[PDB]
Amino acid sequence: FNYDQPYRGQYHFSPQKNWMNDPNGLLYHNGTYHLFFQYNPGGIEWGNISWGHAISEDLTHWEEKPVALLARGFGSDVTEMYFSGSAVADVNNTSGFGKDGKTPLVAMYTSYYPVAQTLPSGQTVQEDQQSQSIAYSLDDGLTWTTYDAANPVIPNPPSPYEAEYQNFRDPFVFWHDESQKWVVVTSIAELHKLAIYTSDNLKDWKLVSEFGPYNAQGGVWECPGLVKLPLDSGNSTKWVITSGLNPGGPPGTVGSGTQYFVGEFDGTTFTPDADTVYPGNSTANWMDWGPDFYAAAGYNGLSLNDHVHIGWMNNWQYGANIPTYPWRSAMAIPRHMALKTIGSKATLVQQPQEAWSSISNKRPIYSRTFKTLSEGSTNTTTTGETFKVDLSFSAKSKASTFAIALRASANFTEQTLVGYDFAKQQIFLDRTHSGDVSFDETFASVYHGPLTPDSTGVVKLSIFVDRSSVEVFGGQGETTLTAQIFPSSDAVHARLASTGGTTEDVRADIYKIASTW
Template sequence: MLTNYITMPILTHKFKTMYKAKFIALLLMLAAVKSIAQQITPTPQWRPVYHYSPPTNWTNDPNGLMYLNGEFQLYYQKNPFENKWGHMSWGHATSKDLVHWKNYPVAIPEVVTKDTTTSIFSGSAVLDKDNTSGFGINGKAPLVAIFTADQPKQKKESQFIAYSNDNGLSYKLYAHNPVIDLNKSDFRDPNVFWYAPTKEWVMTVSMVNEHMVRFYGSKNLKDWTKLSDFGPAGFTKNGWECPSILPLTVDGDPAKTKWALFVSSGGGHGPLIQYFVGDFDGITFKNDNADDKVLTVDYGDCFYAAIAWRNAPANKKILLGWLQNGKPETYPWKGQMAIPRDLSLKTMDEGLRLIQTPSTIISSSLSKLVNNNVFTAKDLAIGSKGVKLSKLGHFDSNAYWIDAEFKLNGAKKAGFYITELKGADGTVAKKVAVGYDAVKQELYIDCTTAEKENKPADNLVLTAPMKAVNGKVRIHVLMDRSSLEVLGNGGEKVISTMIYPEAGANGLSAFSDGKAVISSLKMWDMSILGK
């Protein structure tokens, strides 16, 4: 019939219009079917094995991080219904070792009524051990969640609280919400902690478009008083989100601390997350640096919305961020968390700077789990042809952890080629390079030959300024099926990105543009965790 429409000139205009409409409808239907088919194609090859990802559906920001009863509590932004952003609610998972996770039903679901939709945006949660809120029952301390209620019909964001008396499995909304309401459309992401010197709860919350962090104080988690504002400062070309402030040890001395204020900085160009170092007296944060100084947490293109477990064992402050997915789609989940990172500050020539290392909790857990899948070497000369590190059944599944120290010996570049894919002629056709450029003094990830279809051109090469120390650089490579995190010189610099290796792209080798030597190499094959 469609052919007839094209070839028979005697049809009336009415019938031409009808058949043309049917033709267009058929094309739209076929496009929709193709789109659905693409969305429901499982992608187990990109499912991480040692990073947290939800079993199904969309996830983004980590929320409500607490260490409670020997377990790490993780809430996170979740769409309970589909594999894309929407219907924001709080998902829930717990872990004892930051590797194995137990998943629970949605803890705080989106609320839909005839008059309004209340989406449960990002926030925090606390153990109200002294029951300052009065929500506890039978002498048991309640958990209190503090989060942004996004109400699109009212074009408003305000701060809500909810409480739990079943160890965080479910929450009941406070009857007198909101607890803070400025009648603003962009006012979000409260992060709350107990400040002992003033004996009150302190909240950081983002004044998004003003590029400011507002501090509030409360004795009971219900009634909040403005304390101060910080900003604008640092990077201000994008809106500010997900603020939090932490006391961090300086140069490994527990008696010496400074405060670090973290702010996620929207999207596009510029740092996805920046930080400020200074002092906090329970009311005001004072920045140690000039207002125009920009300090970057992660130099990649996907690490975002990071907050910390404040009360982890040994008083550790462990940062957890969301690794944003780009193209292509993953299924039946979308979104994953970064590796948990221990935080501290270090005195550098330019001042105090953030140090991020894979948390000793997760590194210890993983070492025990894969202790039979470890390769070590010393003084490994690379040479112009490189050194192949993968073979059949070993380091060939794109799930591994590398800790290497390079002695540069005048080499211009040195590092690793990962996700190598050989062409028909046997040579490497595609690869991702992870390494150090001694000429530019940069740690880098180069995805130019492998990810052109998945990344904008200006994100194909990601760099972080870093200096060699006595002619040596240390590089951690955390590759987990689709996530790649690279840490330089013991966590002085970090670059995170997402990559999507195609079938057969699983080779691993070391390279050198010169005579570099790997003075120390240790590699853990994590593929056993995915079996």
């Protein structure tokens, strides 16, 4: 397939054609990273929701595969859609789906039923019901069989939330080694609370606890996850819940976004640390301070120091309207997950997880150092559309702001600015003049996230630009900002900008990135 379209991320996953949303079924198994995703096999907007499927060996070079779970009744009246969920390798055959020595992969997902019906299990479902169901694969995730005999395995929200039958979704299931049980986290979306169940067999589930609401509550809760992450460089660990909400994303944004909670998990209950939850319903721990990072899900099948989340690089506010063709939506750079103690508190730090040496050389295409970068702009350099920029500079700078102008037209009237506000100690990403901003009133905006300098007073930014995206990793990765952009074909220039004064101890390096397709 030819992936050379305007706006087509060359190192971000997108389907060849049609609509994609949430990542699903993230599983590393037998040297393969599976990427399933909410997918419309019949169109460029949301609908006919199925699990699409791609694979890679390195989170970088994706190969799209046949649809894994195809909306039941696709091509006519749809009777069941395959909403979001997760996947595991049932290596001990606890589910009994194994056959001829081959052990099964098992997906757990929300069945969405557009019509009232009686299912092959004998269960009866209401119009627009959401329930949790399972499927299995005996060919390493290539084809799938739905558990028609018993689905759904969790028909109803727990008492007293039976009225929430239409909003009960996004099961994240995993093996909990310590309690020797399967654990699943689901979202009672409208009530901003998660319900946790355990099982010995992936089929029979027992309600064990509920979590929330805490912190951000300005939208429905979706895509819960729970994982144990290393803290700093010793032996200590913490458990982390990631969950999205739509709308009510990070400050300065309108629409969806991803928050997190740091705490402990005993196999049944997640206890948030006292300092991870804040009075009220607004203040939160943001996984990403930008507008385009949602439905972030974690990989099953990875060890303590190797955890990876994948997020959807779009926003529900305007996601239907981005000017992409023949596909719509991409996933963000996969995110390595860990904790570091920053300012006396356990803080999520992400690292851009792709096989960068396979597509990007360590010889920079552009390299400069300035003991004192003059006020104003440097001369133009050409970057093309796909590149990484590393910047470092002194927090002691005299300037108001230091920034790079990215994906800019020759005269820089079109450009995306990524920079640092010295007084406020904030990264900013200004996409107000980034290109096509015509499709939503809230798109042409400036975004901000907190970033303190390191111990030596050095501020570091690592910036990834692809055909329709900028991702900023600040510091050690404690602050990320993810934003789509839609620049014109000539928008391949860059320069540095020191506003209000000079910038001290500047290092800028730009590295070309090649296509993964």
